[PDB]
């Protein structure tokens, strides 16, 4: 899924 959060943390 390319629309999933790609980071370690939320913003």
């Amino acid at each position, epitope marked *: 899924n390319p*629309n999933a959060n*790609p*980071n*370690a943390n939320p*913003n």
Partner: antibody, heavy 121, light 113 residues
Framework: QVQLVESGGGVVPPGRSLRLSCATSGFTFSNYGMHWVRQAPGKGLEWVAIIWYDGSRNFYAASVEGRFTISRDNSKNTLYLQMNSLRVEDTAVYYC??????????????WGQGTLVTVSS | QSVLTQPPSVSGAPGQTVTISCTGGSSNIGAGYDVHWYQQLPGTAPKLLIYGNINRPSGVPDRFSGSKSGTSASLAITGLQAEDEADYYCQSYDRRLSGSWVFGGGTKLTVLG
């Protein structure tokens, strides 16, 4: 402060390869995914590729799938884009962008200055 | 053509208000995927202008605002200043494509001098 700096652009003929770099500073590189965006001269923006913060997933646009390879070197806080079998329509400024996310989609909160790639015979 | 449709150009005089639309479909904006906006000054890289449909980065003046309804989103700029002259892009995600982002065609804003 968040800072992205692209490098590696130049002028090559079709079929040639090229590697773009994006050195970052001012934040923990290993905690963020990274994007590549390109913009042909006088045209609009086109999303190219993404790499997960942990380098576990890579996604590409259909126009580059199989030819471009995105990678990262967390030890050097640097992002890379390996471009193979370059076509003339790959001519564009290439931008480095840091991944961000809201509720149902992502965006880029910081961008680099860009590097020019010219594919011409 | 761009998956998200923008007008190629809009113009306004100093002090006026202008709006820039971003029309999508049932597979992107219509599906609830967040919309974001970028400002690209002449000869410069894009900069984030609006995120999460309606939110301004703390560095963006309060003259810029965004909204969305149904399958369309809109960027509004009040009290136009000559410094606002730039290209504006909307951005979201589309369920039919293999990419994380999808862009609009962009809109060139001219501040009448």
């Amino acid at each position: 402060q968040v800072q992205l700096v692209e490098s590696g652009g130049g002028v090559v003929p079709p079929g040639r390869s090229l590697r773009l770099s994006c050195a970052t500073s001012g934040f923990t590189f290993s905690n963020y995914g990274m994007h590549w965006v390109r913009q042909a001269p006088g045209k609009g923006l086109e999303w190219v590729a993404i790499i997960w913060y942990d380098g576990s997933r890579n996604f590409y646009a259909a126009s580059v799938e199989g030819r471009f390879t995105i990678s990262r070197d967390n030890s050097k806080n640097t992002l890379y884009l390996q471009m193979n079998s370059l076509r003339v329509e790959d001519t564009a400024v290439y931008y480095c962008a840091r991944a961000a996310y809201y509720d149902t989609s992502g965006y880029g909160d910081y961008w680099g200055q860009g590097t020019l790639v010219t594919v011409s015979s | 053509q761009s998956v998200l449709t923008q007008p190629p150009s809009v113009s306004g005089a100093p002090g006026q208000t202008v709006t820039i639309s971003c029309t999508g479909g049932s597979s992107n904006i219509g599906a609830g995927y967040d919309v974001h906006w970028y400002q690209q000054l002449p000869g410069t890289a894009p900069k984030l202008l609006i995120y999460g449909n309606i939110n301004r980065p703390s560095g963006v003046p309060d003259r810029f605002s965004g909204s969305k309804s149904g399958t369309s989103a809109s960027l509004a700029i009040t009290g136009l200043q000559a410094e606002d002259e730039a290209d504006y892009y909307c951005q979201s995600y589309d369920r039919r494509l293999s990419g994380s982002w999808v862009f609009g065609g962009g809109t060139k804003l001219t501040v009448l001098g």
